[PDB]
């Protein structure tokens, strides 16, 4: 019962207090789920029904004998609704002796990792076994825009913004997106394209752009899954994702504990299923750095 | 075995059983007694 | 996580 410093003379009585809840590193949760159209669906798929054209109007005269007019043609886009599974192996001796609620801790961590891993699928995911992201959707230059493609505007120089005038590719990217989509439109960038945009400055050395970190009055989603500024990359996207990108999912995290296969362990198999591609091709424009 | 915090934990053993057969033989004795002796003696040889 | 033997897991 002497000092607490040395362990032998009464230093084993002090029993350090552990944390209340096991913490963690806090990775990026900006996942495009808060800007897109999430639809609950208990099926194999989801079929949005959009209108790729519009009708016609007459201005009928007083004695005109009004004939037929157009009626829009309608596109069905199939959300494949793939599944996302993770299965960590946990020891039964840990779970019986490890006073933190390890089952719901793994549940929180699997839900965090699924919300983080479906973001990369929402952004640059391909066709197979995962949602096809909006970057992998057969880009066609704006002005020559048809329905089966996403538009882009190009900056000029190959690996950077335009040399003579900068902040112009960004502003005609904004004003080449459509009038109603810009009511709630957002930029999507990553954390080192946003840095390169904020580093731009005028001829005097003052950076020319004025907690959501909005750009020109439009909000910015700092993703981590768009590419950075490469030779032909699409680093900055912009548009109405609440009408453009349709996420289809099941709002549950199905956990099955598997005490039998890995016999001294517990082997929690947890899997939610979530899908989605672009629903409205006009609602998203991109920034290509080519020419 | 005990256990390893990281192990395969294979199937350990099972008692190999044995059947012992009690054959249950018979034990028999057949003494021959004369029909003269069994009648003419005073002693009950049939119960002796 | 995994096993209770090795400390870091």
Coordinates of C-alpha atoms in Angstrom, one line a residue:
Chain A
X1 CA 0.0 0.0 0.0
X2 CA 2.9 2.3 -0.8
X3 CA 3.1 4.5 -4.0
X4 CA 1.2 3.6 -7.2
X5 CA 4.3 4.2 -9.4
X6 CA 6.2 1.0 -8.9
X7 CA 4.1 -2.1 -9.6
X8 CA 5.3 -4.3 -6.7
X9 CA 4.8 -1.9 -3.8
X10 CA 1.1 -1.5 -4.3
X11 CA 0.8 -0.9 -8.0
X12 CA -1.4 -3.8 -8.9
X13 CA -4.4 -2.4 -7.1
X14 CA -5.0 0.4 -9.5
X15 CA -6.8 -1.5 -12.3
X16 CA -7.1 1.1 -15.2
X17 CA -10.6 2.0 -16.4
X18 CA -11.4 1.1 -20.0
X19 CA -13.5 3.2 -22.3
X20 CA -17.3 3.2 -22.2
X21 CA -17.8 2.5 -25.9
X22 CA -15.0 1.2 -28.2
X23 CA -14.0 4.1 -30.5
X24 CA -12.6 4.0 -34.0
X25 CA -11.0 5.8 -36.8
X26 CA -13.7 8.0 -38.5
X27 CA -13.4 7.5 -42.2
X28 CA -15.3 9.6 -44.8
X29 CA -19.1 9.1 -44.7
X30 CA -19.9 11.4 -47.6
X31 CA -21.4 8.7 -49.7
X32 CA -23.9 10.3 -52.2
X33 CA -26.7 8.7 -50.3
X34 CA -27.7 12.1 -48.9
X35 CA -28.0 13.6 -52.4
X36 CA -29.6 10.8 -54.4
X37 CA -33.0 9.2 -54.6
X38 CA -33.0 6.2 -52.2
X39 CA -36.0 3.9 -52.8
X40 CA -36.9 1.0 -50.5
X41 CA -37.4 -2.1 -52.6
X42 CA -38.1 -5.7 -51.7
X43 CA -37.5 -7.3 -55.1
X44 CA -34.7 -8.3 -57.4
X45 CA -34.6 -5.0 -59.2
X46 CA -36.1 -1.6 -59.6
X47 CA -37.4 -0.1 -62.9
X48 CA -37.5 3.7 -63.0
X49 CA -39.7 5.0 -65.8
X50 CA -38.5 8.3 -67.2
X51 CA -39.5 10.4 -70.2
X52 CA -36.8 11.0 -72.7
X53 CA -38.9 13.5 -74.8
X54 CA -41.8 15.9 -74.4
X55 CA -45.2 16.7 -75.9
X56 CA -46.3 19.3 -78.4
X57 CA -48.6 22.2 -78.0
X58 CA -50.9 23.8 -80.5
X59 CA -51.9 27.4 -80.0
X60 CA -55.1 26.4 -81.8
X61 CA -56.6 29.1 -83.9
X62 CA -60.3 30.0 -83.8
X63 CA -61.1 27.9 -86.9
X64 CA -58.1 25.6 -87.1
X65 CA -59.2 21.9 -87.0
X66 CA -56.6 20.8 -84.6
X67 CA -54.8 17.5 -85.5
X68 CA -52.7 15.1 -83.5
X69 CA -49.6 16.1 -81.5
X70 CA -46.7 14.4 -79.9
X71 CA -46.7 12.2 -76.8
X72 CA -43.4 11.4 -75.2
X73 CA -41.5 8.1 -75.5
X74 CA -40.6 6.4 -72.3
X75 CA -37.4 4.8 -71.1
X76 CA -37.2 2.0 -68.5
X77 CA -33.9 1.8 -66.7
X78 CA -33.3 -1.4 -64.7
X79 CA -31.6 -1.1 -61.3
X80 CA -30.0 -4.6 -60.9
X81 CA -30.0 -4.4 -57.0
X82 CA -26.8 -6.3 -56.2
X83 CA -25.7 -7.5 -52.8
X84 CA -22.9 -6.4 -50.6
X85 CA -21.6 -9.0 -48.1
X86 CA -19.0 -9.1 -45.4
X87 CA -18.2 -11.9 -43.0
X88 CA -15.7 -11.2 -40.2
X89 CA -14.5 -14.1 -38.0
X90 CA -14.9 -13.5 -34.2
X91 CA -13.8 -15.7 -31.4
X92 CA -16.3 -17.2 -28.9
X93 CA -13.8 -16.7 -26.1
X94 CA -13.6 -13.0 -27.0
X95 CA -17.4 -12.7 -27.2
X96 CA -17.8 -14.3 -23.8
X97 CA -15.1 -12.3 -22.0
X98 CA -15.0 -9.0 -23.9
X99 CA -17.5 -6.9 -21.9
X100 CA -18.2 -4.4 -24.8
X101 CA -21.2 -5.5 -26.9
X102 CA -19.0 -7.0 -29.6
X103 CA -22.0 -8.2 -31.7
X104 CA -23.6 -4.7 -32.1
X105 CA -20.1 -3.2 -32.4
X106 CA -19.4 -5.4 -35.5
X107 CA -22.9 -4.5 -36.6
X108 CA -22.1 -0.8 -36.4
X109 CA -18.8 -1.3 -38.1
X110 CA -20.2 -3.5 -40.9
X111 CA -22.9 -0.9 -41.5
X112 CA -20.2 1.8 -41.6
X113 CA -18.1 -0.2 -44.0
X114 CA -21.1 -0.8 -46.3
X115 CA -22.0 2.8 -46.4
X116 CA -18.4 3.6 -47.2
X117 CA -18.0 0.8 -49.8
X118 CA -21.3 1.5 -51.7
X119 CA -20.1 5.1 -52.3
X120 CA -17.3 3.9 -54.6
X121 CA -19.9 1.8 -56.4
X122 CA -22.3 4.8 -56.7
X123 CA -19.5 6.9 -58.2
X124 CA -17.2 4.7 -60.2
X125 CA -18.7 1.3 -60.0
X126 CA -18.9 -0.9 -63.1
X127 CA -21.6 -3.3 -64.3
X128 CA -20.7 -6.6 -62.7
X129 CA -21.9 -7.4 -59.1
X130 CA -22.1 -3.8 -58.0
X131 CA -24.0 -0.6 -58.9
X132 CA -22.8 1.1 -62.1
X133 CA -21.5 4.5 -61.1
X134 CA -22.2 7.6 -62.9
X135 CA -18.6 8.0 -64.1
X136 CA -18.8 4.7 -66.1
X137 CA -21.8 5.8 -68.2
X138 CA -20.4 6.4 -71.8
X139 CA -19.7 10.1 -71.8
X140 CA -20.5 12.2 -74.9
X141 CA -19.5 15.8 -75.3
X142 CA -22.1 18.4 -74.4
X143 CA -23.8 20.2 -77.3
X144 CA -23.8 16.8 -79.1
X145 CA -26.0 15.4 -76.3
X146 CA -28.4 12.5 -76.7
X147 CA -30.3 10.6 -74.1
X148 CA -28.0 7.5 -73.8
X149 CA -25.0 9.4 -72.4
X150 CA -23.7 12.0 -69.8
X151 CA -22.4 15.3 -71.0
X152 CA -19.1 16.9 -70.2
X153 CA -17.4 20.2 -70.8
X154 CA -13.7 20.3 -71.3
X155 CA -11.2 22.6 -69.6
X156 CA -8.5 23.1 -72.2
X157 CA -5.1 22.0 -71.1
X158 CA -4.5 18.3 -70.5
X159 CA -3.7 17.9 -66.8
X160 CA -4.9 21.2 -65.4
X161 CA -7.4 24.0 -65.8
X162 CA -7.2 26.4 -68.8
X163 CA -4.0 28.6 -68.8
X164 CA -5.4 31.9 -70.1
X165 CA -8.7 32.0 -68.3
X166 CA -9.5 29.7 -65.3
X167 CA -12.8 29.3 -63.5
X168 CA -14.5 29.4 -66.9
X169 CA -14.7 25.6 -67.5
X170 CA -16.3 25.5 -64.0
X171 CA -18.8 28.2 -64.8
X172 CA -19.9 26.9 -68.1
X173 CA -20.1 23.5 -66.5
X174 CA -22.6 25.2 -64.1
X175 CA -24.5 27.0 -66.9
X176 CA -24.5 23.9 -69.2
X177 CA -26.6 21.8 -66.8
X178 CA -30.2 23.1 -67.3
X179 CA -32.3 25.6 -65.5
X180 CA -34.4 23.5 -63.2
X181 CA -31.7 21.0 -62.3
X182 CA -29.7 23.9 -60.9
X183 CA -32.3 24.6 -58.2
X184 CA -30.9 21.7 -56.1
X185 CA -27.6 20.7 -57.8
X186 CA -24.3 19.9 -56.2
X187 CA -20.7 19.5 -57.1
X188 CA -19.1 16.1 -56.5
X189 CA -15.3 16.2 -56.1
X190 CA -12.7 14.6 -53.9
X191 CA -10.5 16.1 -51.2
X192 CA -7.5 16.8 -53.4
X193 CA -9.5 18.2 -56.4
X194 CA -11.2 20.5 -54.0
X195 CA -7.8 21.5 -52.7
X196 CA -6.7 22.2 -56.3
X197 CA -9.8 24.3 -56.9
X198 CA -9.3 26.3 -53.7
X199 CA -5.6 26.8 -54.6
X200 CA -6.6 28.7 -57.8
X201 CA -6.0 32.4 -57.6
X202 CA -6.2 35.6 -59.6
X203 CA -3.1 37.6 -60.8
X204 CA -2.6 39.2 -57.4
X205 CA -2.2 36.2 -55.2
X206 CA -5.7 36.2 -53.6
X207 CA -7.6 32.9 -54.1
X208 CA -10.5 33.8 -56.3
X209 CA -13.2 31.7 -54.8
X210 CA -15.1 33.1 -51.8
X211 CA -18.6 23.7 -43.3
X212 CA -20.6 22.3 -46.3
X213 CA -17.9 24.2 -48.3
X214 CA -20.1 25.3 -51.1
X215 CA -18.7 26.5 -54.4
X216 CA -20.4 29.4 -56.2
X217 CA -23.5 28.9 -54.0
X218 CA -23.8 25.3 -54.9
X219 CA -23.0 22.6 -52.3
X220 CA -20.0 20.3 -52.6
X221 CA -19.9 16.6 -51.8
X222 CA -16.3 15.8 -50.9
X223 CA -16.2 12.2 -52.1
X224 CA -13.0 10.1 -52.0
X225 CA -13.7 8.0 -55.0
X226 CA -13.7 10.3 -58.0
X227 CA -10.3 10.4 -59.8
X228 CA -8.0 13.3 -59.2
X229 CA -6.8 15.6 -62.0
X230 CA -5.3 13.3 -64.6
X231 CA -4.8 13.6 -68.4
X232 CA -8.4 12.7 -69.4
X233 CA -10.0 12.4 -66.0
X234 CA -13.5 13.5 -64.9
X235 CA -12.6 14.9 -61.5
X236 CA -15.5 17.4 -61.0
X237 CA -19.1 16.4 -61.6
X238 CA -22.1 18.6 -61.1
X239 CA -25.9 18.2 -61.2
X240 CA -29.2 17.3 -59.7
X241 CA -28.5 13.9 -58.2
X242 CA -31.8 13.7 -56.4
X243 CA -33.4 13.3 -59.9
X244 CA -30.3 12.0 -61.6
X245 CA -29.1 9.0 -59.6
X246 CA -31.5 6.4 -58.2
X247 CA -30.3 4.3 -55.4
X248 CA -32.5 1.2 -54.8
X249 CA -32.0 -0.7 -51.5
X250 CA -33.2 -2.6 -48.5
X251 CA -33.0 -0.6 -45.3
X252 CA -31.8 -3.4 -43.1
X253 CA -28.5 -5.1 -42.2
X254 CA -29.1 -8.8 -42.2
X255 CA -26.7 -10.6 -39.8
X256 CA -26.5 -14.3 -39.4
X257 CA -24.1 -15.7 -36.8
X258 CA -22.4 -19.0 -38.0
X259 CA -21.2 -21.0 -35.0
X260 CA -20.8 -24.2 -36.9
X261 CA -18.4 -23.9 -39.8
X262 CA -15.5 -22.1 -38.0
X263 CA -16.1 -24.1 -34.8
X264 CA -14.1 -22.2 -32.1
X265 CA -15.2 -18.9 -33.7
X266 CA -18.6 -17.3 -34.4
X267 CA -18.2 -15.9 -38.0
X268 CA -20.9 -13.2 -38.3
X269 CA -22.1 -13.1 -41.9
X270 CA -23.8 -9.7 -42.6
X271 CA -25.1 -8.6 -45.9
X272 CA -27.3 -5.8 -47.2
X273 CA -28.3 -5.4 -50.9
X274 CA -28.2 -2.2 -52.7
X275 CA -28.2 -1.1 -56.4
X276 CA -28.3 1.9 -58.6
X277 CA -27.4 3.8 -61.8
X278 CA -28.2 7.1 -63.4
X279 CA -31.9 7.7 -63.8
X280 CA -32.0 11.0 -65.6
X281 CA -29.1 11.5 -68.0
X282 CA -29.6 15.3 -68.4
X283 CA -29.2 15.8 -64.6
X284 CA -25.4 15.3 -64.4
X285 CA -22.6 17.1 -66.2
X286 CA -18.9 16.3 -65.9
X287 CA -15.6 18.1 -66.2
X288 CA -13.2 16.5 -68.7
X289 CA -9.6 17.8 -68.7
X290 CA -8.9 16.8 -72.4
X291 CA -9.4 19.7 -74.8
Chain B
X1 CA -7.7 -31.3 -26.2
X2 CA -8.0 -27.9 -24.6
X3 CA -8.3 -25.1 -27.2
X4 CA -6.1 -22.6 -29.2
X5 CA -7.5 -19.1 -29.4
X6 CA -6.7 -19.6 -33.1
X7 CA -7.2 -23.2 -34.2
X8 CA -9.0 -25.6 -36.6
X9 CA -10.4 -27.6 -33.7
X10 CA -10.7 -30.9 -35.5
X11 CA -12.7 -33.9 -34.5
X12 CA -10.9 -35.4 -31.5
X13 CA -12.0 -39.0 -30.8
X14 CA -15.0 -41.3 -30.0
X15 CA -15.0 -44.5 -27.9
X16 CA -14.6 -47.6 -30.1
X17 CA -17.0 -50.0 -28.5
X18 CA -16.5 -53.7 -28.0
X19 CA -19.2 -56.4 -27.7
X20 CA -18.4 -59.3 -25.3
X21 CA -20.7 -62.3 -26.0
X22 CA -21.7 -64.4 -23.0
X23 CA -22.1 -67.8 -24.9
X24 CA -24.5 -69.3 -22.3
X25 CA -23.5 -72.9 -22.5
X26 CA -25.3 -75.8 -20.8
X27 CA -24.1 -77.8 -17.8
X28 CA -25.4 -81.3 -17.8
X29 CA -24.8 -84.5 -15.8
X30 CA -26.4 -87.9 -16.6
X31 CA -25.7 -90.5 -13.9
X32 CA -26.9 -94.0 -14.7
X33 CA -28.9 -95.8 -12.0
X34 CA -29.9 -99.4 -12.1
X35 CA -33.6 -100.2 -12.1
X36 CA -32.9 -102.9 -9.6
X37 CA -31.0 -100.6 -7.3
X38 CA -33.6 -97.8 -7.5
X39 CA -36.3 -100.2 -6.4
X40 CA -34.8 -102.6 -3.8
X41 CA -32.8 -100.2 -1.7
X42 CA -34.3 -98.5 1.4
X43 CA -32.7 -95.2 0.6
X44 CA -34.4 -92.7 -1.8
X45 CA -31.6 -92.8 -4.4
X46 CA -33.9 -90.9 -6.9
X47 CA -33.8 -87.8 -4.6
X48 CA -30.3 -88.4 -3.3
Chain C
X1 CA -12.7 -8.8 -33.8
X2 CA -10.6 -12.0 -34.0
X3 CA -8.9 -14.0 -31.2
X4 CA -8.1 -13.0 -27.7
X5 CA -4.6 -14.4 -27.7
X6 CA -2.6 -12.0 -29.8
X7 CA -3.3 -8.6 -28.3
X8 CA -3.7 -6.3 -31.3
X9 CA -6.8 -8.0 -32.8

